[PDB]
Amino acid sequence: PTTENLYFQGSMNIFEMLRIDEGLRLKIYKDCEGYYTIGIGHLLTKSPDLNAAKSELDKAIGRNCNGVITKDEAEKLFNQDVDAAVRGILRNAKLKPVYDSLDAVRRCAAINHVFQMGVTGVAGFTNVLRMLQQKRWDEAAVNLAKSRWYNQCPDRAKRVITTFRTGTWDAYKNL
């Protein structure tokens, strides 16, 4: 690894990670599951009604957006969504002990998974959680690859799974 490569881990964090997995869009769009989304993976609603999604957007941003936001607004909403995912893990009696047992990079993958799926969805992955606590990284990754989360939308989930296998940032290199 070159001096520069050893620097790459100092450049990666949860925000850079989810920015790569979710992308950055300033106008309402439908995600791989057809749900209305904006900014950096902010799901607006599961409703098929774009009017509901615009309604949620104006609530979330606090102004009349008509389906469009700024980069700074995207970043603020993203920061809030990351904070909610971390808070959701830390207050949960099932997820917290597993999170605490993980190294820093796998902790980012855990916050990413919760950002994407929500607390109850993730907390239902009983086998994977046990595998992760037991440092069975290959098995955890194979099991995550059986999930509907990954299989319905592999490009958004694949790097998180690789990160659970390896505990490094390699999946985020060389975009």
Ligand X SMILES: C#C[C@@H](O)c1ccccc1
- Residues known to be catalytic: 22, 31
Instruction: In whole angstroms, give the CA distance from residue 110 to residue 163.
Output: 10
Three-point CA angle 146, 168, 91, nearest 5°: 70
Residues 163, 108 contacting (CB under 8 angstroms): yes
38 versus 141: smaller Cβ distance to ligand X: 141
138's tokens = 């290959």
What token pair was written down for 105?
Answer: 């990079």
Rounded Cα–Cα distance for residues 41 and 150 (Å): 15
Q: How far is the CB of 147 from ligand X (least distance, A)?
A: 9
What is the closest distance, in whole angstroms, from the C-beta atom of residue 16 to ligand X in the complex?
Answer: 18
Radius of gyration of the chain (CA): 17
**Smallest distance, ligand X to C-beta of residue 118, A:** 11
**Nearer Cβ to ligand X (67/118):** 118
Binding site for ligand X (CB under 6 A): 89, 95, 98-99, 110, 113-114, 122, 125, 128-129, 132
Tell me whether residue 28 or residue 132 sits nearer to ligand X (CB atom). Answer: 132
